[PDB]
Design a protein around this ligand. Sequence first.
Ligand code: HEM
Length: 154
Amino acid sequence: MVLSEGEWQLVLHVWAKVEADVAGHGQDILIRLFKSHPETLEKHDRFKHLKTEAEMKASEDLKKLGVTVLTALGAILKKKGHHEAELKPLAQSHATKHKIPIKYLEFISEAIIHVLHSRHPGNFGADAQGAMNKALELFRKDIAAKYKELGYQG
Ligand code: HEM
């Protein structure tokens, strides 16, 4: 798939707001993911023991992971589709080391959309959400193709 320049502008415009508080958005997104799909928490040997949302909010390790996730995703989005180089090491670690099924990438995509809709209603109307969804779908499709080449595809 290919996004138009107008769609990229909608995506990067809301992303600029997200970047005013990377740590806070990172926390919100991961907690939303863990609450909505607890099975994803099991993949994180580092956080598997957290029992409540309060414990999650207090974890400095989870906050650091959130910043790492958003910083990597932001670098990919800013490439506006020309992200092959950035995708390779990410696909390799998530397929071979962490063993993350594509299904879980869809779950985190849902969490990103939920949080942006909650925090940026004025900059995340229907058109902006459609553009962000298209960007995340492109990301998942390209990662899935890489998983297959790497021998995982799942
Ligand atoms: C927007 C999608 C995502 C991005 C950009 C992303 C990015 C990253 C980055 C950059 C790291 C650190 C270096 C590495 O190991 O590659 C990481 C680690 C990891 N990711 Fe992801 N990730 C994503 C989605 C997921 C999902 C959905 C899961 C699990 C349900 C996941 C599980 C992990 C695990 C287990 C680690 C290691 C965490 C640790 O250090 O203990 N990732 N991810």
